[PDB]
Structure formats: C-alpha cells, structure tokens
Subunit: 431 residues, 4 copies
C-alpha cells in the first residue's frame, strides 16, 4: 500500500520488464498530422505566438478564418492498419510502444466522454485508435504505453485556472484526471508517459492521488511504470523512471533508471510532409545513441510520426528496419543487460561496455585502422574467450603489462560484415 505523497510513491520498485526492454518506439499521432508543417506545436506557434511563417502558411493553404478545429474532419486516417504497424515494430526489435493518446491540442485518440466531438471517434478517423493499436500490439506480446499531456493550450477551463493562479481546479476535475482514469481502466496500459506539466505544481494536477490510486487499486498496479513529468520541478526528482529533458544525454552513469527519448526527424515529433533528407537522423547516429544509452543503464525511445492517412513513410520504415537488423545480431549485448563498472574507455575509439551475467560486451563504433582493438578495462585470468557476435570462431588476443588487451579483429571484405555501424565483442571469464 502506498500513500499520496512523493516519499511514499518514490519507494515503489520498478517492474523488471521496463529495464529488460531497453528499446521502445514512440508514436506522435494526432490532429497536428493534418497540417503536417513546422512541428506538432503548430497550434501554439500559429495562434498562441502568432509567428508570421505559420500565419503565412494558413493564409496560402486554407480559406480565411480557418481554425484549428476545422482540421478535425481532415484527419481521415483511412490507410491506418495497426497490424502492419505492429509487424513493423516487431521487426524493428522494439519491446514496447508508446502512443500519444492526447497531446497539447486536447484531441483524444480514443472516445473520451469528456472530449465530446473532439476525439478520434466522433470526428476524423471515426475509430478508437488507441484500442486498435493496443489490440494489435498485445497480439504480438509488445508492451503498451500511453502518452498523456496534462495541459491543453487553448482549453477554456485550463485558461481560467491559469488566470486564477491555479487556485482553482476546473480543468483537472473536468478533463485531465477523468481522461487518465479512463485510459487506465481501459486498454490496461503497461506504461504511462506523462507530459505538459511545466506550468503547474503537482498539487494542482492531483498527481499524488492519481499515482497512489494507480499503485493501489488500478488493474495495472502490478506492472505499470510512469515517467517523471508530473508537475513543476518533478523531472529527475519524482516518478518511476526519469525522462529528465527531451533528448537527454548524460555524461556519467545516473543513479536512477532513466530513458532517452529522441526523434528520427530532428525538427519535429509529429510528421512533416516537407521534411528533407538532411532532417532525417542518420542510422549510424541512431545506433550510436542506442548503444550509449543502453551502456549507461537507460532505455531508448525512438519517435516516428505517421501521416494523416495513418501511414508510416518509407524513410522511417528503413531506419526502424535497419535498427531491427542490427539488433538481430547484437541483441545479446542489449536486451536484459546491465551497465558495467566502466561503460566506456577514456582513451579509445569510442568503445562502450555492457554486462550480462558473466559475459561482458564491448561495442565499438569505429573499426580501428591497425585492425587491432584495444581494451584497457577488462582483466583476463585463465579462461577468457572472445566471440565477436555474428562472426564464428574465437579471436586472437594478447595481454600487455603496461597496456591492456589487444584483440585481432577478423579482417573481412567490404560489404561482408553482419553489421555496418557498430560491432560487439563478447568476453567471457573476464572480471
């Protein structure tokens, strides 16, 4: 039993599945996919800030007086096939999938009773997107996470609460908390990704009461995990795992379980129709970020943005499928792994360390020119063996009294290596 207070809530141990997953897929999907321009913050940039570029876009592409709510019917999503999405996520090696049920626009991707005529069922897709995707993912043993934004930019009740200094709680009692309760009682989420919390304290959001109910009497109380975005000054301080800032890149090992969320599109989480090839993150960068995150004990959350028709564009599919291809070879060093005592060598070619049981894995992202890999951290005693996942046969290794360990990598012809951006060396009998 837990009580509605942060010292009690923070003592809950994390379910082991989240740590063992190490790789999830983030989906940003909503009405913002209809303009598909600028970012998922289109409504705020256009109306809340009045940026001239967004006003020009609306002037040139839509009749005068066009409002953001008019985007609703245009969110047709007539090519959405959740089974294909789930198959792609499985082929990408993803262990969990986090879908945005509601973003700052306030448009819920499920039939919310408190979001009437502003949900995916009443207008637009005329479907329960959250339920369909959840069914498809549960059929393939993939964990489900629901992204919920606490705030809404232009909701009148939230604006009224903000005008009152958040001394009233009309918005929380009307929309936010009922939506969270409905999202938990149905679709039975494994993960809750909270957002939109930087404007108000946790007392206003009623976060402690909801978290106590979730941990005590919710149907998912046993194996649910939540992030740290539950109010002002709550990041990296309160919650299940720490998301900290977006695209978080710690320099050392954090003392709490964390997760780095990053987007394949460098300038938007939602889909952009005019996205250039340069805006797309390179695959070597994605694999390097995954390796560095997993080596430092964190989870990796890669984001894609579907189109308004419910399709994942071929470039995102290529990136995800190449991630999955690399994982199909180097997953023994990633899934259900733990950070080692070093996790990266000081003077090296960017070698990163993971551990699993008695096995140590050194992932290097740059083939040495001399053809010999230098590992000055490991200590070999009697029965050290080298594997080099994907290549058969134990490699040759030599010890040095002043230097460390030198391993002769197997020279291979071009376009003949199982991986192309990173390689894993497996050492057994190494302390």
């Amino acid at each position: 039993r837990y009580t509605p207070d942060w010292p009690s809530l923070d003592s809950r141990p994390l379910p082991a599945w989240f740590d063992e997953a190490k790789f999830g897929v983030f989906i940003h999907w909503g009405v913002f996919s209809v303009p598909a321009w600028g970012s998922e913050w289109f409504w705020w940039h256009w109306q809340g800030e009045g940026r001239p570029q967004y006003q020009r876009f609306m002037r040139d592409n839509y009749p005068p007086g066009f409002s953001y709510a008019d985007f609703g019917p245009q969110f047709t999503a007539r090519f959405f096939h959740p089974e294909e999405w789930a198959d792609l996520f499985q082929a990408a090696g993803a262990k969990y999938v986090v879908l945005t049920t509601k973003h700052h626009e306030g448009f819920t991707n499920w039939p919310s009773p408190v979001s009437w005529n502003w949900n995916s069922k009443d207008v637009g897709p005329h479907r329960d997107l959250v339920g369909e995707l959840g069914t498809a993912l549960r059929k393939r043993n993939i964990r489900y996470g629901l992204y919920h934004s606490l705030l809404e930019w232009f909701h009148p009740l939230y604006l009224l609460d903000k005008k009152n200094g958040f001394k009233t709680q009309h918005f929380v009692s009307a929309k936010t908390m009922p939506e969270l309760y409905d999202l938990v009682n149905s679709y039975k989420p494994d993960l809750i990704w909270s957002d939109g919390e930087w404007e108000c304290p946790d007392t206003y959001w009623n976060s402690t009461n909801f978290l106590s109910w979730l941990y005590n009497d919710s149907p998912v109380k046993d194996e649910v995990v939540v992030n740290d975005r539950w109010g002002q000054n709550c990041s990296c301080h309160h919650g299940g795992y720490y998301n900290c800032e977006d695209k978080f890149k710690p320099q050392s090992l954090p003392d709490h379980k964390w997760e780095m969320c990053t987007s394949i599109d460098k300038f938007s989480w939602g889909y952009r129709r005019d996205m250039a090839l340069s805006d797309v993150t390179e695959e070597s960068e994605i694999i390097s970020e995954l390796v560095q995150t997993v080596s430092l004990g964190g989870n990796y959350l890669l984001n894609i943005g579907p189109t308004k028709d419910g399709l994942i564009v071929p470039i995102f599919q290529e990136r995800l499928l190449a991630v999955g291809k690399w994982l199909s070879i180097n997953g023994e060093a990633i899934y259900a792994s733990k950070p080692w005592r070093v996790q990266w060598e000081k003077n090296t070619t960017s070698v990163w360390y993971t551990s699993k049981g008695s096995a140590v894995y050194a992932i290097f992202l740059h083939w040495p020119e001399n053809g010999v890999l230098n590992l000055e951290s490991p200590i070999t005693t009697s029965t050290t063996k080298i594997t080099m996942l994907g290549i058969q046969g134990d490699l040759k290794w030599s010890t040095d009294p002043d230097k460390g360990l030198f391993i002769s990598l197997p020279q291979l012809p071009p376009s003949a290596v199982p991986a192309e951006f990173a390689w894993t060396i497996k050492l057994t009998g190494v302390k």
Copy 2:
C-alpha cells in the same frame, strides 16, 4: 425573494412587456442547417433511429463514415448580417426575437467554455452569433430571448445519466447548468425558452434552483420571463408562461398566460433546402393564427430557419413582411390588447374580439357576401362609433331587438383594401 420550489416560483407575476408584445420571431439556427434536409432532428433520425431515408441521403451526399461532427466546419455562415436580420424583424412588427443558442445537437451558438471545439466560435462560423444578434436587436429596442435545450441526444454524460436512471447528475453539472448561467450572465436575456425536458424530472435538471437564482440574484431578475419546459410533467403546470405543446391551439380562454409557437415551414423548424411551396404556410393562415392567438390572450411566435450561410430566404422574408404590413394597419387591435368577454361569435363568419381600454376590436377574416357585418355580442348605448382601421369615416350601423348589430362595410374596388386577409372594426362606447 423566492425559494427553490414550484409553489414559490409560480407566484412571480409576469413582467408586462411580454403580454404587451403579442408577436415574436423564432429563429432555429445551428449545425442542422448544414444538411438542411428532413428537419432539425436530422442527427436523431439518422443515428438515433436509423431511418433508411436519412442513411440513403448520407450515402448519396457524403463520403462513407461521414459523421455529424464533420458538419461543423461546413457551418460557414459567411453571409450572416445581423443588422439586416434586425431590420427585417422590425419591419415584420416583431416585438421580441427568440434565437436558439443550443439545440439537441449540443452545438452552442456562443463561445461556451463547456462546449469546447463544438461551438460557433471554435468551429464553423468562427463568431459569437448570440452576441452579434443580441447587439443588433438591442440597437433597435427589440427584446431578446434565448432558446436552450436541456438534453443532448448523443452526449456521453447525458447517456451515462440516462443509463443510471438519472440518479447521477454528471451532464447537468458539466454542461447544462453552466451553459444556462453563462447565457444569463452574458447577453442579459429578456426571455428564456427552455426545451428538451420530456425525458427527466425537474429535480434532475436542477430547474428550481436555477429559477430561484434567476429570480433573486441574476442581472435580469426584474424583467425576465421563462416558459414551462423545465422537466417531466411541467408543461402547462410550472413556469412563467405556458407553451404547453408545440402549435398549441386552445378552444377556450386559458386561465394562464400562454404562447403559441408555429413554423412557416409546416414540416421543419430548421431550414430545408428542398422545401416546396406547398410546405410553406399561407399568409392568410399566419394572420388567422395570429388573430386567434391574440384574441385568446396568448402570444404568437413565428419560426424561420436561416440557411447555413446565414441568409433568410425570400419566401420567409415575404411572409414576415406581409405580416408586418398587416400589423402596420391593424396593430391598434393587437399590441397591448386584452381578451374581451366573448373573444369569438358562436354563429358568425369567424369574428374574433380584442379589447383595449374602452375600445373593442372585431377582426373578421371573411368579407360577408351581403356586405353587412353582424355583431351579436356588442351592446351599443348612446355614443357608439365605428372606425374600421385603415378606412376613413364612421360606418353606418343599425340595432335589432332579436338580432344584434349590423354594420354596413364600405364597398371598395378589388385590390384597393388596406388589408387582404383580415379586417378590423373598432367600436367605442360599447359595453
């Protein structure tokens, strides 16, 4: 001071303006004007009942999966000019105008905080229709009435309350009562036309508390009037004036102030684009209904339906303008008048009686063939004079010992009478 109970609320005397008005204009305007087919009950007939004709209409006119909320953006109302509306209503002789702020579809014609993205400001017209029309009417000294429907067909909270047997009040606390309070505190209505009450008791709707607040602390407490649609079994029993049933035609004088509401379109209150000329009420019928209603002490509420562009079609304009032309001649017998002791003759050519001070007015709708009007009710003593509003000179009259009074009407050439469907005889010095 009044208390939240019907015996206390029913004791409030009616403000005299409503009785002195005797003629108002009803406006049914909303999202149902976009399909403009069948009636304003389009959503219920299509989805709540599944009538094959409405399903066929939606199949033939819209893409598959089209929902009622998608009609929202199409409610452009780009030709709405409230000043022209107010000028037409003034030229029609209307003393008050009742506009539907929200109908059973739940779409509010003003920026309701509890109807986010389902109101005339967020979607569709992108305007506050109620406020603009109110400003235009207040500039011309025309009283304003707000029509509010208590129920909504497909609102999830109302459906939940109905499922619980109306033992919960989620819908009332969330949408209905806040909307009524906002409609009263802004736009300062002179009339409240309640509707959508036949499914629930007044206790569920919180009608007594709202009416007590309206009569005690509202800004319009002094001169506001309400109808009788405040719950189950409330018609003709509770409220300011009695609307009773739609198109109410009493046979005798009612003991409570009442109002007959009727529509120029015989088959719909909302606008229909395929309305035939036969569906349009004849002008003689409209004037006859007005005369019979005013003679029986009731008010007359004539309804028009604007198009989705905010225009009043020429046929409705012609009907209203001919009503106003007749009133410009015969308004001395209508405005600020009272029912007489007879109000209609038993054996006549449909003569109806009104009174004002010491003057009696006999409105006849059929010119007698003999050219002599027979009035067996009035009693002349010494100084009886006949006026015949619109015609100069006192007419000749004769008394009979067994019969009543015979008045020689002024014979006139065709297309030369001020009125064409009804004529008024004014008698002074008549008991």
Copy 3:
C-alpha cells in the same frame, strides 16, 4: 430549299406553334450557379474586368489561387428532378421551355465531344442535363428550346481569333459549330436561342451556312425557330423572330414577330443566393408585362435561375404558379391570339386588346373607381355580348354618341375575384 444568305434565310415562314405559344420559361443554369453571387457574368466581372467586389468575394470565400474551373466539381446538382421541373412548368402555363445548354463560361450542359472535362457529364453533375430535361418536357408535350452562346470569354482559341481580328476561324471550327450541330442532331430542339454574337460578324460565325443546313437537311427543319442573335448588327434584322435587346418593350406594334425575355430576378439571370425580396419582380408586374407583350404580338419568356443543387427556390415557384393560376382563367385571351387594330386605348386605365376569331378581349390592370369600364375603341352593332372570363352572366353595357362603350363590372367582395392583378372582358359581335 434555302441558300446560305440572309435574303434567302429571312424568307422562311415561321412555324405556327411559336406564335400560338405566347409564353415560355427561360432557364439559366450552369457553373455560374456555384458562386451564385453577382450575376451569371461572375467570371468576366472577376477576371475579365477585375472588379474589386468580386475579388473580395473570392478572397473571403475561397483559398488563394482558386480558379473558375475549380467551381466545376462543386456543381453537384444532386437534387435535380426534371419531372418536378416539367410539372411546375406545366402548372405555370408555359408552352415552351428554353434551357441554357452552354453560356459564355463555355461549360456545356451535355456531353460535348469538343468540351472534354468541361461539361456536365465529365465533371460536376455527372449527368446529361439537356437530355434529361428534354425527355421530361417531351413527355408533357412542352416544346424544347436550346440556348447556345456563340462566344466564350476566356477560351484560348476565341482569344486567338480576336487577336487576329477574326480573320481566322479556329474557335468556330473547333467548338462552336460542332456544338451547334450536335445540339441539333440530338435532343431535336424546337427552338434555338443564340447568344454571344455582339463581338464578331456573321461571316466569322458561319451563321448563314448553319442556318441553311438547319432549314434544309436537319431533323428539325420542319418546325424549328431561331432568334436574331447570329452576328454583329443582326438583332432585329436577320433571323426567325426578333429578340432585339434584352427586356425589349416596344411602344407600338412591331412589323416582325418578336419576343420579350425578362428575368424574375431584376439583377441577374443566374441564381443568386443573397437575392433580396425587393430584387424579386412583383407578380402584378409579371402579369402586366405578359399582357402588354401578348397584346403587341410578341412572345413572353420568363427566366428563372436554379441553384447549384438543381432546385427551384420557393419564391420563383410562387411567381410561376401564380402566373399559371392567372392563365388558367384568362388563357382564352392569350393562347393562339392575335393583336387587334388598336391594342391599347389612348385615354384609359391601361386597357390592352387581343383578338381571336370573332372575339375581342380587353384586359384591364386597374379596376375603375366608378365601377364602370370605358371602351372607346370597340363598335357594337346588333348582337354584342359581354363575358368577363371567370364570372358567369352577360354584363350590362351602354353606348354613347360622343363617348364609347360603358360596361358595368360585377361588384364583388374583397378576396373573391378569380384574378387579382388583371381582368379580361370578352366581346363578341364587335367589329
């Protein structure tokens, strides 16, 4: 046999049906009904002249860069029911119906091979409007007339011909003449209403050759009639009957058969959605114009504009049905009638004369105040009888040596005369 020259073509006697008809209905229907604003000259006023009001309308109602061709798909005409149209035209007393097959916009209302993807079949209604209306009218013994505009405002071939001083005939050989031949060989028209001819001579338009072919080898050679709009300076000089100018009102009897075309809407031939009641021609004016036209030996062509959905608005229906109601009483003086030797009295109350066999008809539009009608033209000898169509019994009449004839009209109560705007006196045995 006729030859391609005006002296030969003008000698063709008119088929008697056109003279015996005396009343037709004009239909202006096309892509211009989609904007339904300003007039049917919307495209020219907007793009060919650049009037600021039309540019403002397009700015406020459509996205930037919207072109006139984009109006094409919006011409849905999904409520078009030609049988209802034909029934209304029959109930209006119309003997022939002239529909615009193609206007200056160049959009053909039939599947024209030379107007690909710019016709009612390929885009918009997806129907052959001309064929459907023709079938409906032929089922009810109503004559069919096809309105064809020779010019098109923005057709590139016509603009090229105009640039060359009309010394080339690319437009005529490509579009105009093939369209006329297709319109004649199919739908077998009884009338051809030519238009759009004021910019070019008849030699450019190839009018003489087409008319010779029509009179010699066309399927309708026996009973086809054409108007006078076949080139520059051709009005009132060349053609079957003379339309002269639009809304032609001769002061005396013309020496050639003519036709007055007028529109119920005073400011447009096409439909206008914001048309006011004042813009609608009064019914007394319509009946007066018909009487004056028929008395002067001309035909009367009343125009209506259907909406983009294919509906005739209730006000146009009311005007047409009241015309038909008046005709149902006074058609003996109109249909198959001839102008008399006087046709109107010099000093009267606007009495107009028609003749049929030995019967003379005096239509008066103003009931005399004295109750006696003065007819100073007719001469009675021995067996003169008075009928007063719609009223039973011969009226009383008296002759004067210095004055003319005095007829005692039957005094009637208000709202009891068969007609309300004009009355007909029938005199037999009158020279």
Copy 4:
C-alpha cells in the same frame, strides 16, 4: 534536309550530348498523383477495366459519382519548388531531366490551348509546371526532355477515331499534333520522349511529318533527340534512339543507341502514398543497373514520382543522392564513355567494362573473397598502370600465361571505402 519518310528520318546522326550524358532523371507527375494509389494507370484500371479494387478505393475514399476530372482541383502542388528539384537532380549527377508534360489522362502540365480547363494552369496547380521546371534546369546547364503521350484513354475524339478504325484523324489534328508543336516551339526541348503509340500506325499519328518538321524548321533542329515510340511496330525500328520495351535489359551489345528507363518504385511510375519499403528499389540494384546499361552503350533513365503537393519524398531523395555520391567518385568511367570490345567477363564476379580514350575501366560489384581481382580480358604490354578511382597509389598486378591478370586490391577497414556497392579499376596502356 529530311523528308517525311522513315528511311530519310533514320539517317539523322544523333547529337553527341545524349551519348555523353549516360544518366537522366524521369519525372512522372500529373493528376494521377492525386489518388496516388495503384499506379499512374488509375483512370484506366478504374473506368476502362472496372477492376474491383479501384472501385472499392473510390467507394471508400470519395463520395458516390466522383469522377476523374474532379481530381483536377485537388492537384494543388503548393509546395513545388523547381529550384530545389534542379539542385537535387544536379546533386544526383543527372545530365538530363525528362518530365511528363502530358500522360494518357490527357492533362497537360502547361497551358495548352487545345486542353482548356484540363491543364495545370486553368485548374489544379494554377501554374505552368513545364516552364518553371525548364527555367530551373536551364539555369543549371541540365538538358530538358518533354514526355508526351500520343493517346488519351477517354478523349471522345480519340474514341471516335478508334471506332472508325483510325481512318479519321480528328484527335490528331485537334489535340496531339498541336500540343507537340506548342511543346517544341516553347520550352525549346532537348529531348522528346514519345509514348502512347501501341494502338495506331505512324501514318495515323502523322509522325513522319512532325519529325521532318522538327529536323528541318524547328528551333531545336540542331540538338534534339527523340525516342522510338512513334507508332505501331516502331519500337527498336524507327526513331533517334531505341527505348524498345520498358525496363529493357539487353544481353549483348545493341547495334543502335538505346536507353533503359526504370522506376525506383517497382510497381508504379507515378507516386504511391502507400508504397512500402520493399517496393522501393535497393540502391545496389540501381547502381548495378546503371553500370550494366552504360557498359552496353545505353543511357540510364531513373524515374521518380512527386506527390500532389509537388514534393519528392525522402526515400527517393536518398536513392538519388546516393547515386550522385557514387557518381562523384566513379564518373570518369561513366560520363562520355564508350563500350569496350568485351563489356563483361564470361567467368568472373560480374565485372563490366567501359572505355574512354586510352583508358579502360573495370567496374566490379562484388569484392572477391581472396582479395585479388581477376581480369582475363585486358592485355598489358609495357606501361600498364592501375588507378582504382578513389584510392591513391598504383596497385600491384601480375600476369599469367594460362590465366589473365591478377590485381591486388587495397585491403581497407569496414565503412572506409569511398563506394559501397561497386568499385572501378582504371587501366592505362592496355589494349
């Protein structure tokens, strides 16, 4: 001077620029990009064949009765930036760009006088796409080619000609030939890519007369090249260069200059919105096809399909940019090269030969496992030198009396070779 006959026309020598180009970019862009489903043959599959899948797509995505012409306004192309297109084509190494001016749908991408209201200027983009792209490409010294389809599926004049057995030429005189003349006299094309010719003989299409005019009096007579699609049985027999069949892969060296046209999308030339990653041609396949085509003396024409908004999707950009990256290293073996005397080794690892002056280039697509490349065709005499484009320093080579030549390739670490799918060896002093 040339005469309108194939023996005279086929004797015209090809301008040297086309042979020296060796790589062009094909653009399929039109109204078919609006449905973006199935292929660019959407109209024929839907209406000309009635395939159930296309009918189902139209049923589910558009209102009933939707026609192909209604797609016209939806072709907005509001993100089309020809300068970005030209920059991408330059960065892809393309020497010429062929854009579809008109496809079988009959929709012209320029303001055609004979395609009124069915062209990119009157409807849809409201632009001259051909002119804008031509200006952008001419600014960057890239040759321009216009793709013109002779036939149109549903044009009434073409259907009439087909019904008559092509004994009439209404379609050719009305649309096809004027469009070709306008396309030549404006935009001054360097290449003409004819299509849609398999149904009619060249006599019907007037191909010989047009080609004689093009070679004699056209503004581009000096340096224009045409393909072989000018009538029935004209492929590989008549015309400038031979396209033969689509995706032509000869097994031996052809005796006439040819060109292989292939599409990055394996199942469509036009853009498909639901195209899968598997449907996208792999980059190694593209480079292999280019190498095999250039080695056999042909040109390579790679096709992309822009979206209806005028954007090139990131996957097509990635494929083109990687082609350009490979060309930036291996263009000395491709541009302005000639087929050698062998062009491929019988027993090898798929080595292909090109020649330029005294230099021979051997492109191999598979790194040998032994690390030694075997070239049994070349003969070294005294001064043979090896270059290996992209790698500095002459490689070591050895001759054999019974075998051929063995070259020791420079062993390199993974992800360190300038190219990744093919490598070029340059031999000088080799006969």
